[PDB]
């Protein structure tokens, strides 16, 4: 079997990038919508045998990509393929991980329900927003951390990095940022904003000490900006001196871009598992960590 | 087990139909979208025990309403809802239920086994483009027709209806066709275009006579209308007096109102399996068939 | 893995002649039946990690036939051969595909799930009587078509072929007459037996013009021959110059042989999808195509 | 949910003593053989939300009955039954029950998994070859034994039934002999065919005292006979006054009556699992145990 | 159908607290082990139709108490039963919920299978160590929580609440943590160990103030005790008045016992989910918290 | 692929000489438990399309052995193994091969389903209590025999063997002693324990004559040797002048050693299923057969 490197709409950008450094050209697909919105995937090319590869990820159209997804799995299944791999940068549905609420659903298990029930044997995913979505699944599911590369960003960009202070924007992502302290050697702090018990005024509580010192914000994603914009302003009251945000995840849907543009972050950086370039064009304060590479050797080490 | 009855986004006015003529408040959802465009569902009621049926078209932003649709029955299936049925009055990617092509999807059946994987147990819809779809399921699929509708129409609409022709617009409408014209006691003819081996004219064949009588073009559905406009000029150009077009689906995606409104059509009749109200605001043409009492009678047979 | 190909009791002459074709001797298989008509096999070979390729035709003993080819499936598939497909030339049940019929039983269905369940790997069969029966599986099924042999023996067996007119006996098949009446670029006409709603004649509609002209029916099968004899009367009484019928499935059971040698057939034409030797020597009229080298290729590609 | 009682072809006798003891009527099926032999099955009436019992024995054309049975099972799955049940008094290839030979199906759990995708939920059996076929299915098996019905008819039919001893006819049936002679607190004897090493005479070797005693051979089933024959003979030659069989499944294939005509038994005593009225007309010897009433008990014990 | 409450041989204190708050006997169950070490279950009543529910802990023999409670699970299947759901107060293996090492087994994920496989419809639980655990399984799972009962305990029990701190002993307890003191309006405090480099000393480091003040250590288990014991040397050492540490799974297994014995702990507070009489008899330190009637809320509202 | 083979902690002698004899060396596993009792597998190499045999008997900590391979072969599957066999020379659960008593659990079948959902994809065995456990699986199980070896230590040590007869402990062993007869051309017996109406004395009936002969016992397992030794009391007391037992499971749980050593054995010989030196240190009556070359070759057949 040899791989073939197919990419849906959403990101197509890294499916090139992931193609050149395997050293091997995309899969012919033409993944367009019939007049009706339906979802049209026209596989130009046999996969007979084949390891096939998809990367989809989960942002822009959600539905959309995640119909193009599941449909290019069963094409490809259909089509006698030896083994069909789902690689997902940014799952989608995965903050739906859990019932918590009367009547809620756990999306994060229904698409990984859909994607099994598609034929998908294998899963090469980046920080999934919880770990244990890798048990919603009877595949092997790869989580890949982008740590190492915000820790690379990190010694590169920020000259006071050994004296900076690693701050979590929540309560949830205190194992994210504990582990990026202890790799840094460096201290860390804690953001929390306490529940909605009525209409008041959100205030946020910070545990450890950030005064005078650089303020990494470090978090799994995010999505409007509010966690880490309203972080931003607790670290600056605090008395931090500069405040970065460092994400692997930016959807910056929404009011994010405005909210960052007028917030006081030194530079809010991502990955590349989502498309950033619309971003980046109308906020400079963006940068891109490529994780392409990281992607790259999960494939080819899946296949070998 | 009560009737718990709720609505997707697609066709709202539908299920407060249903719900009316079943004599029944609809059941408390919130379907909206996460500013990310992940489908949000938020049931505000316990399913506990109860007999859920869904009500969720196939039509208008087609992959956001089906992801709805899963979310919902599997939302309801870990609520604890005794059964949970899908009212799909248009079957979403029906037309896909097939592979004659390589690489092809047969994406009917992987929409089939996502509600399938969802936990539904009953399928209630409409006119399905192929009856074998219900095959696609290993759970009771009721398969209703608006054909007792559209003869209802025909006979109190359409004074000179037994003197009438009955016009398939394609080779696949025949059976349709051929059955609508037995219990009308008419004639009936077919038109073909046949196949595109070049970039020369598209024409069309017909087999039957129409000449200085009324033609009724039946099919199942009309997406474009390129079939249905190409058949009434080809009937037209044979001698019909007038030409009428009745569709069970009147999907009406692109430029279909632009080529109804410049057609030679009578009238456009479609049900309202598909919402209607956008599209008759911009062609007078067109004229709707309500089949919620079928759909209540299936559901109200189906608890039963 | 090495391509094996077993033989049921059904077509045993088949499976020679694609052994042949693929140049292999044919598997050692024992398939009898124990004293009380229970199915016996006995395969007389390893297929340990072997690509196991089983023939067996939907004719003959319909029954004794599907349970043979399940338990050579399961046989095989616990025997630890690497691959089972089940070369099924006519796919029985196939007429039973929906369910369009209180309390129908969708038998098409039942039997993938059978095959599926005695672990089929993939099917490849011809000319399906409904190709949504590929849908009926979650493993690839291969439909082939013997359209292409149908239209070479037309060119070199009917002088006037290219001013005949294809004929469909039922508006079932009126996408496959308009096909073949497409690619030779001849007329069609279409032939309908209007519904039995109380016990007077059957009369038969003809659309289109056979007059002076020779006419092709084309089938999908002939079980009983009622359908292509009741249009050969219709196409005489309609002035046709002379009548030829072409199925791919010959079934013939019941009345069928007393009916064509009574019939005014040219010529009735079907596949060797089921054993014709004992068929042809009742009626003179049935030629026979050879399909073997499509099976074979299919097999072929498959395995490749 | 209501009981239905539905008969196959099998044995419609035994199903109507069934639901005469249940003081209902059989439901209205009407199960043929279209032209081409495959099976017809009619449901005459809705089994929505029913209690559905399918009584379909093995015996007579075996695979027609099993896939009638199937056919069923599905048709009424489908057609919403709230609990299907095959009452299969004789279980179909339950003799190939393991894989003691080279590429040898387990045919028994073949069938097992084909009434488990067919939708069976409950199966009610009596006197399986293996009682390990329960395990075969994931759902509850009820495995009726007529042993007290056999001990009922020992007790009243034989005189000196105090005196006899129970003979095995071969090894396999020693738990069986020993459990009857237990209950009747008898001797019990046990006959072994050695193995055929190579084409000399069939010897049988005697364990246990049989001579100037009453001999009653039991054993699961006769189908061929030759074990009882071959033991009666042997049991004669050891000096036994009178030879008895009493076998719970009469299936007296092939040249069964013949050998029993020509034997030496006292009688032929079997249960009516199997029908046996063409059986009687050609052997006096033979006497049925009605078990009709443990079938009952059991449908009405499952059902409540 | 009726409620049936089974006790496993895990904790049977528990199960009669529940019973006799359901007002019921437990279900007639004899669980021993057979000579050989393998679990013996004889269900001693009819479970038919009837609503079934298993409470095992993961506790003592855990895996031991876990085949115990999947026998059980099966045999109440097989038996017909209505509705089987395993309530697992404490839920084993919780702790493997994710592959974030080589070759590492989810044991939940495996726990969640076999429990699906052994035929739980419902899972009734509390504070797992996940709540993705949750989605594991594709039936309802109910992650019931102890919170409540821990801030009543806290606010009847330590008389400075009020201007208590809760500490998080780790960094994944920080949403724990950071919900109990929104509940009681206080302040919090988080402690992490860093990670194990070297074999230099383990120093933890406190985020923070805990000074003059009463700190409460809440975690959801205590299993080795080095974690509390640990964080309460710190908090000593950080200035605490006093120390208590809250827990709602008091595993205590090994050093635990002698850890808490030498530790500086007001009190150790854990719920029954697993069964404290043993550990409180060598340690005065330990209270427990009744969860019976969170348990038997959860099942009365599972079966209405 | 490479052949990988793992031991459990049941019996990692036997696992060493089959690596030996297979010229491979152990995979790096690390078997252990956590603090509280939880089965811990650390597989220490990579096993990504290997071909991997996990072997673990049924003994010992029969529930213990048994999670450790259910974990071990998951955690094998999601590393991505190309196929993971359970090599299990005694089948744990065996005996709980059927439902015979109300409410009873079949937990041989709950073991292969077990087993199943962890992934294995073959089962390699020895002598199961029942072959129908095969069935039990829709795998293909390997079900090797040692009365091979059985044989070659008769004709080896016991001088009188042509001479001998060989006898069943119960009724259940006739068809294994029946055989072992036939292949030795020696004479049989078998003894049965009638049922335990009340509590009288337990009294033995032996069919066969064995005065002046040596008898040799073969069962298939001596667990307390309540059977052996009560048929070794038996044929003592009907004049045999020597008595051995030969099994191929040697349990010897509970009593077994003290009723051993206190009867009348010449030699109780076991087969190496089950570890068996801690045994024959205070049992010198026994003397184990080596079985590893059997499982060595079942092992490099599958593989090849
Ligand atoms: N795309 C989305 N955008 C916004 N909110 C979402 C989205 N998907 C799910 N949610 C909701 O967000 C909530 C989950 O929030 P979040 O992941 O920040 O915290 P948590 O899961 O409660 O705790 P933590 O991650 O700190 O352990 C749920 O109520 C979920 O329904
Ligand atoms: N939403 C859609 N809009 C347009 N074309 C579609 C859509 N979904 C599928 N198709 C394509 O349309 C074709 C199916 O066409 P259609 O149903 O008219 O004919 P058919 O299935 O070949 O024959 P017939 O219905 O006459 O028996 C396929 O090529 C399929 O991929
Ligand atoms: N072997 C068989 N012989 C005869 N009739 C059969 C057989 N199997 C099924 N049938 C019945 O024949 C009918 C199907 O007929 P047929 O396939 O000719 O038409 P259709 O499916 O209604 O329409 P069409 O094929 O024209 O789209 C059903 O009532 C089915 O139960
Ligand atoms: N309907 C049948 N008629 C005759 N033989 C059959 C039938 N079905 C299976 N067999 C064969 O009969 C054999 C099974 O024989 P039988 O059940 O008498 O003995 P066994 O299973 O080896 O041992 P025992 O039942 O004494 O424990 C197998 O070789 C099987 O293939
Ligand atoms: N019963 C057990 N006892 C001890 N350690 C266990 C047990 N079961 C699993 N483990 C191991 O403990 C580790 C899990 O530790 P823990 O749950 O404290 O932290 P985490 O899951 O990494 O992060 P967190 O819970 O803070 O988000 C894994 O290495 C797992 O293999
Ligand atoms: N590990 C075990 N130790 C002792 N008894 C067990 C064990 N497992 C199951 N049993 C019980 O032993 C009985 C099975 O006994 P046994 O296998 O000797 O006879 P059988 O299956 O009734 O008949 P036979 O094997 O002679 O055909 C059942 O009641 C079963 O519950
Ligand atoms: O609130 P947003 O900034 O939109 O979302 C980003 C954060 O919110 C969620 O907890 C994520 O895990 C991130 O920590
Ligand atoms: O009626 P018969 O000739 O027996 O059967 C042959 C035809 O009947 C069915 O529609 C088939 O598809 C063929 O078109
Ligand atoms: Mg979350
Ligand atoms: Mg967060
Ligand atoms: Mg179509
Ligand atoms: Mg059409
Ligand atoms: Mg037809
Ligand atoms: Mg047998
Ligand atoms: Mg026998
Ligand atoms: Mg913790
Ligand atoms: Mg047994
Ligand atoms: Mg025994």
Redesign the interface.
Known sequence: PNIKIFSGSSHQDLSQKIADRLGLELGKVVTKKF?????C????????GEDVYIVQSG??????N??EL???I???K???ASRVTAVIPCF??AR???????????????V???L???GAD?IITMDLH???????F?I??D?LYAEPAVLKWIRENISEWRNCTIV?PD??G??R???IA?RLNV????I?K??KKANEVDRM?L??DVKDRVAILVDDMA??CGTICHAADKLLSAGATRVYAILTHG?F??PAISRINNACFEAVVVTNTIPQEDKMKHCSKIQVIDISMILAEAIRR?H?
Chains 1, 2, 3, 4, 5, 6 share one sequence.
């Open positions: 007049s009706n919105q339906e979802t995937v026209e596989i130009g090319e046999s996969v007979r942002c822009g159209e959600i539905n959309d995640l119909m599941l449909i290019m069963n094409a490809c259909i089509a006698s989608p549905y739906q991980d859990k019932k918590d609420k009367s009547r809620a659903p756990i999306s994060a298990k229904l990984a329900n859909m099994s029930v598609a294998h919880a770990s244990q979505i890798q048990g919603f009877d092997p599911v989580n979590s309560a949830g205190a194992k940022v504990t582990s202890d201290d860390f702090a804690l929390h306490e529940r509580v545990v450890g999505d409007t959807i849907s929404g899946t070998n």
